[PDB]
Paper text:
In bacteria that live in hosts whose terminal sugar is a sialic acid, Glucosamine-6-phosphate deaminase (NagB) catalyzes the last step in converting sialic acid into Fructose-6-phosphate. The enzyme NagB exists as a hexamer in Gram-negative bacteria and is allosterically regulated. In Gram-positive bacteria, it exists as a monomer and lacks allosteric regulation. The monomer folds of both HiNagB and PmNagB are conserved and resemble the E.coliNagB open structure with seven-stranded parallel β sheets surrounded by eight α helices.
HiNagB crystallized in the P 21 space group with 12 monomers in the asymmetric unit. HiNagB forms a hexameric structure (trimer of dimers) similar to E.coliNagB. The cryo-EM data analysis confirmed that the hexameric architecture of HiNagB is conserved both in the crystal environment and in the solution. In the case of HiNagB, the molecule is a trimer of dimers. Interestingly, the trimer is not symmetric. The angle between subunits A and B—is 120.6°, 116.9° between A and C, and 122.5° between B and C. This results in a complete 360° rotation. The combination of rotation and translation results in a slight asymmetry in the interactions between the A, B, and C subunits.
Residue numbers in the entry:
A (entry chain B), B (entry chain E), C (entry chain D), D (entry chain C), E (entry chain A), F (entry chain F): 0 to 260
The structure:
Amino acid sequence: FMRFIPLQTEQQVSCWAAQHIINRINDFKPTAERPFVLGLPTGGTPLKTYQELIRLYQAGKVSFKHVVTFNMDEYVALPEEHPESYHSFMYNNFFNHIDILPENINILNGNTDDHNAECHRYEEKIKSYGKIHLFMGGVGVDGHIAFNEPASSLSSRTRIKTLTQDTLIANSRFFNNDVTQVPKYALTIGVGTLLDAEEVMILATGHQKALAVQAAVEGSINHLWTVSALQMHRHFVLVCDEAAQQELKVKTVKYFTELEG
Amino acid sequence: FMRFIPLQTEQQVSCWAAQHIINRINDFKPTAERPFVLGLPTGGTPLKTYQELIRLYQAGKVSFKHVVTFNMDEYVALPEEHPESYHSFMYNNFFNHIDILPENINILNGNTDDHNAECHRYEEKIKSYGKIHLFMGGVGVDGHIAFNEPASSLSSRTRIKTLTQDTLIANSRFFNNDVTQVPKYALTIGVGTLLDAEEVMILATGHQKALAVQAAVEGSINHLWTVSALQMHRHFVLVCDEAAQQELKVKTVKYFTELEG
Amino acid sequence: FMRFIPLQTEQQVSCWAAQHIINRINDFKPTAERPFVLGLPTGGTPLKTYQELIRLYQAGKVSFKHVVTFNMDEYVALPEEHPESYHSFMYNNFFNHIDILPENINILNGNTDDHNAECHRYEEKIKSYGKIHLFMGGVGVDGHIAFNEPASSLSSRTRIKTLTQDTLIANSRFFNNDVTQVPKYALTIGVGTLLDAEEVMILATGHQKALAVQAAVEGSINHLWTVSALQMHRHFVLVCDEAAQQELKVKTVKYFTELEG
Amino acid sequence: FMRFIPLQTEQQVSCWAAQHIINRINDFKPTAERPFVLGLPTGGTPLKTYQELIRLYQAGKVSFKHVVTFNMDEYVALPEEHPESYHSFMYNNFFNHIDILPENINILNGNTDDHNAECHRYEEKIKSYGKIHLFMGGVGVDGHIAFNEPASSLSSRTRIKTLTQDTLIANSRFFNNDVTQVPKYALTIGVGTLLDAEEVMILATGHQKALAVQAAVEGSINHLWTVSALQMHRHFVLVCDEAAQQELKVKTVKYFTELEG
Amino acid sequence: FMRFIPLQTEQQVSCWAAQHIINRINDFKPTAERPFVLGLPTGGTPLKTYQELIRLYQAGKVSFKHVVTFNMDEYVALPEEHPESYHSFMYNNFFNHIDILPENINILNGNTDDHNAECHRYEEKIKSYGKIHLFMGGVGVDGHIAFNEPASSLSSRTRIKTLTQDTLIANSRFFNNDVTQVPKYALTIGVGTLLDAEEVMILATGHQKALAVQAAVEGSINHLWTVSALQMHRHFVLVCDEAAQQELKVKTVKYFTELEG
Amino acid sequence: FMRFIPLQTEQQVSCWAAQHIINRINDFKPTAERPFVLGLPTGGTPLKTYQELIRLYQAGKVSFKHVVTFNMDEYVALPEEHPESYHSFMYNNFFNHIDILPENINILNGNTDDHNAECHRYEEKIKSYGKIHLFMGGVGVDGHIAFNEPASSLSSRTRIKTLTQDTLIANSRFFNNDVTQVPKYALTIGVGTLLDAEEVMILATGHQKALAVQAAVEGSINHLWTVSALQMHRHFVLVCDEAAQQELKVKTVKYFTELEG
């Protein structure tokens, strides 16, 4: 069944998420021949989690020497050494501070000569390892996942996507508030790619995600709220802060707070 | 306009109600010529409030030597010394334990020769005092007030009412679970009579009152939920326990919890 | 406050309305100096009601010798002896079969030299009688009243109105299915005119009126459903057939069906 | 796919359910080697059906000499000869009045030394017969099935469950209205166990089940209403009384009333 | 997954649908041994599309010399040469004006001696060709498909159906507005038959279809709205006019309007 | 009753508002003895209107000589010459560029020795002129008006208000993104003060105001959405851009778009 973890502060969400990733890896006991495969996102709430994971690694609570990562997405036609590329985000905020092997980091390359070939290569790389064991991600204010469109097929695969006007505006702040400077296209994993993971953990902090949280927990599966499709996943975890609880009914928070005791 | 007091336990609800009545009386400074006029109901939750008022009176925190009371209702064709009459409920559980003057207790007489004249005398008696300063009451699971029907006119007056099938069944527990023994009619104040008070305090405890609480706080005015009409009252107070908050949104409880402190 | 009469067939709706008009007249005991003032509409369901009223008059159960009528509306620039005028509908189907005095029939004149002057004369005529005691009417699928727009001011008065595209289409069947032949304008009473009546009885038969009936009975007051504003009227009666109850909940019909019996 | 049978009285509900069970058995024509497997619940609503089933047996309209029964649940650490055990409920109200073979009655044993082993033995016993042909059951006010929590996996199996505070409160009436006297744990079939039956008949009587019936018939599949998951079952039957129809739309009751007869 | 094409006029809807059928056929490049298989409906909106298909054929933009058609339904016990039979509708409005081979026209025969045998023969004929490549259809005001009941199993097959009271009334206009003159039964494809097609194009024109469009586009899958089940189809296309958009939210139309351009 | 003006761009919203203010003043023909009284707010969309009003003044299309203004609010314990004070906002962006007389500019003083006396003088000053002829304002994301709380009494008066946590965060961007630097309290007009104006024009631009616009146009009056109470105002105007329409139904936008043209 769906696991809903209602918490109060964004730090508690990040600390909980990091702890969950630690426990799965440490229970899995990964080796070189049998690595743990981790799906990873970008953004503000992930950032706090990566920071917590670095702190836990600096202690003696985890090693990434046998963790393989796959990232959700990357901009197209943007140099991968650009400060605002998703390559740069991952290496600067995470991979450069942990003991992961450089050949176990997978991030879509948006500068290939053939974007379809690159997307198929990504899907193949995942299959070569078997399956992603834990995919961490976020959710949009409209319930969309990664750069997938809000009404995306639940069996969509990794493909090239044209960024929406709203996505262009949202990300403008990373490119000098210039909509014309945001890359028009990106490579993203599909909803099917996400659903193929053994466990999907979605992190939702902020009042702007409260409607997405209501759709995920209280609503029925709606094909206009991609996050609601995770209700059909065998292990769907949703962690949220108090601001994102504001649209739920009192009985909903009561039920899940007490279940998690 | 509307004050919503969300509390946890039924005990806290009665204590809050008792304290509020104390403060209203003690601020008002009643005299014999200028008494404080209190509207009073019957039932389980009021009983706890009357008990707390008695304890506060014994603690010399209040005197009723200048409080005039009006009760909501009384059965018709039931001897007023019968255990299950509302005369008996009020005197045995409250008036016989406080310093109220016997001539300041007003309760509808359901044994008159003329129920319309009796109801009219009651409305006149209130007018002779000016106005009820604080009317305490409860609310039905369908939002009805006193013996008024769930679709009662917002200008209904004191009148005779035929008890509903649900009310007959509900009150059967007081007459040996015999529907045939519950009085068929009762004299009740109208919704207009209630709204004419200077302040209306409604007490709502129980999971069975959660939908009525949602209608009063979150919903628009609906003529099928009489309690919602109190939204237009100049001083409408609603006190409720945890079980009755369960249908509200987290943001609704949050807003009013913080306002009151 | 609101009376809802849920019936099965359109015949039952018409008979109930006729009986109600009969009973109001007979209780009022009208005289020449103090006549009973009746507001009247046109249409299919009214036709059956007028037929039933004629039968009751022939059965000497009522006299209209002291009833004054005001009609809702009339086409502009249509000869008043034209078959499709509302003058013709009223006289041919009703007034020519009863004992009403010819000088007590009031119908807006859509052939005046000054429609604003004409509309003002109509409002003045009504005030000269005091108030309409019972106004019968229908309701549009969008809850609109007469030729008033669905968002009409609740204080709109009798005025000239440009017929909507939907009203032109609906009424084409009376002019050889030719939208170009329907009069473009009409003189209509306002929503304020309707609410000034002592009692408003609206008759709603048909599956296409089920949403309007739901808005009037179950919904809160919405200014886009003019019929719902009648919830705040002192005597609002709504009579409907089974097809018009299909959007209501079983509890709504149960409460009112048992109240009326 | 889904059959909804709306009736008026609890007697009609029990009569319909009993007849359906009769018809399935008699069509199946069970033998000793190929028995009919019947799943059975506990509670007030089942009781009337069991009484009706006894009467139909007395009327020689059915024989249980070749029916094998499996019950949903039983208390743990309560002697099975205790008046309030479900063993006692089934035997006193049903099995002691019909011709079932004593070795064909299966009820979870809450007094074993190994509750997991007992639960597995129960699932195995079902497997040994093939599958349950008809599972009769009730529904909680929150749509839960048997002792499963409203957030149980739709593939949950027979297991030990800690009774919720709500179930403890509900069941206090059988243990002197004392929450501390209700057994803390119980053995219950899972939602998966129920869904593995060839047909599921849910019985819903009472005003307190109106919201649950709305969730099963009118709502989409919601993972917080276990009863709504039965919409995906190949043969889902829901029988309900008039009090449980109160939250449905008139069009829903109309549709199914006409379809079923 | 789901394609929603919001257009303005009914003409544009039929023109779009015709063009889509043309393009599917021309890409498929059908041969006699490998024909293109087309599913076809009856009604007002299909009529305009067939007219456009005839115009495009005269313009030599398409040939049906290798198109095989299957129709949704046909009346029972009505001579197939009757003006109001669906045989007549299809031949008069379509087949008599195109170059389809007469042995490639498939329409259920409601005059067989064995309606179950006929329905199985129809299902078998579809199987003999493999699958329907494109199924065009309409939608009822309650979201039902063909003569399937609004609560039909999503795996229903071609079968005989008793026409509902509402269906009898709707079709009365073709039989002298006499409910008793409409055939009581019809042969119809099942919902499973429709879902087995490679692509399903539903056409929805009219204000009376706006609620069904909202259920298909905005709502979750509801087993009382058959059209909503098409959300789970691999290629579901819904084309509608402005009147059918009136119940959608502005953001819904905006999203899909921009997607298609 | 209520005018809803749906437009596309924020420029059009400000231009319409300015034009409306122009036309009201010019029709009124104000003199020194009989001035036009204008209520004014602060914020981004108002600023664009003030620029347009200055442009219209430079074009000699209006004079503000005989115009008296009243502002909604002002911070307390902030020097009125501070860049971020509302005194500074109004003078720098409006009053210093028009021909208003310095003795006709009214703005609450948040630096008085007695804020209650200060509030009363403000209400009295309004009464001394008679009534505000046109009050322009904005609306919060929760429908709140000025610094009034979202559940404010509809008869609240000018008073001191403690800024909510949300208001502190929102305005932090004007004080170096420092919540601790935003003044804790503010002087604000009450909801009653707004309703006492002869006309209320609310301007709503932005996707974050779409829910407030839906509450004002489509919803019933809710005491938790202050803007919805303006439905009972004699002349309530709401102007909005395309981003703020996104939550309305297509039929709502269609109706009012056609009404205004």
